[PDB]
Amino acid sequence: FIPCPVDTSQVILPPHLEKIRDRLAENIHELWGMNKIELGWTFGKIRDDNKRQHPCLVEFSKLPETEKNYNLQMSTETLKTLLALGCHIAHVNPAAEEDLKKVKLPKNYMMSNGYKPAPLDLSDVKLLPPQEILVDKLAENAHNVWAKDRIKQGWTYGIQQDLKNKRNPRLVPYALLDERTKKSNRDSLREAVRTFVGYGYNIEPS
């Protein structure tokens, strides 16, 4: 009895948002790597879950084509969702990108491949109240997107136990979701909106 997500099928990403979509996908990967490393994950030729090695702890260009199409897609779907909800996105700050800097991480983050994540320094960016509302909307809708896929793939609500045989206790309406599970992907969609403001774009609600 989970809601339906918003329709982004007939939404075409306007070519003036192609660049910023590539920026978000780049930073999404940088944030992913930093978080993995801070959980102790190292690089390995192949991913071992006991050894905490992963092949994707690598520079973005060298990322396999399968993953880049998943990074760019999730970023493209974020933008497509913003358009469908009634938001208007415009570039209002050519100057602002020049004021953008990547964080310099210490040496312990660098791996054997020589890759060191360099995420954007978005601490100075502070969101506006209606923008912070918009981050909740994208979070709730990303959930309905995710739940729609898993249900189509044959997943059901399972009790608090999580079962590989296609049962997940997170398959509940969003209002019923645990507050701890909300923050994980809500903090990830909050940095995405900061990237837009950071590159000088303005996300105006409806």
Domains of the chain in start order, with CATH, are 15-204 (1.10.490.160)
Q: Which two tokens stand for residue 1?
A: 């009895």
Burial class (CB in 10 A: 0-12, 13-18, 19+), 44: middle
167 half-sphere exposure, CB direction, 13 A CA radius: 7
User: What phi, psi does 54 have (nearest 5°)?
Assistant: -145, 135
36 half-sphere exposure, CB direction, 13 A CA radius: 25
What are the start-end ranges of the E strands in 36-189?
42-43, 53-54, 88-91
Contact 57, 43 (CB under 8 A): yes
143 half-sphere exposure, CB direction, 13 A CA radius: 22
Contact 29, 102 (CB under 8 A): no
Contact 42, 57 (CB under 8 A): yes
- Distance, CA of 120 to CA of 25 (rounded, Å): 12
- Distance, CA of 5 to CA of 69 (rounded, Å): 21
3-state secondary structure of 172: coil
Resolution in A: 2.9
Q: Which residues contact 130 (CB under 8 A, 6 or more apart)?
A: 205
What are the start-end ranges of the E strands in the chain?
42-43, 53-54, 88-91, 201-204
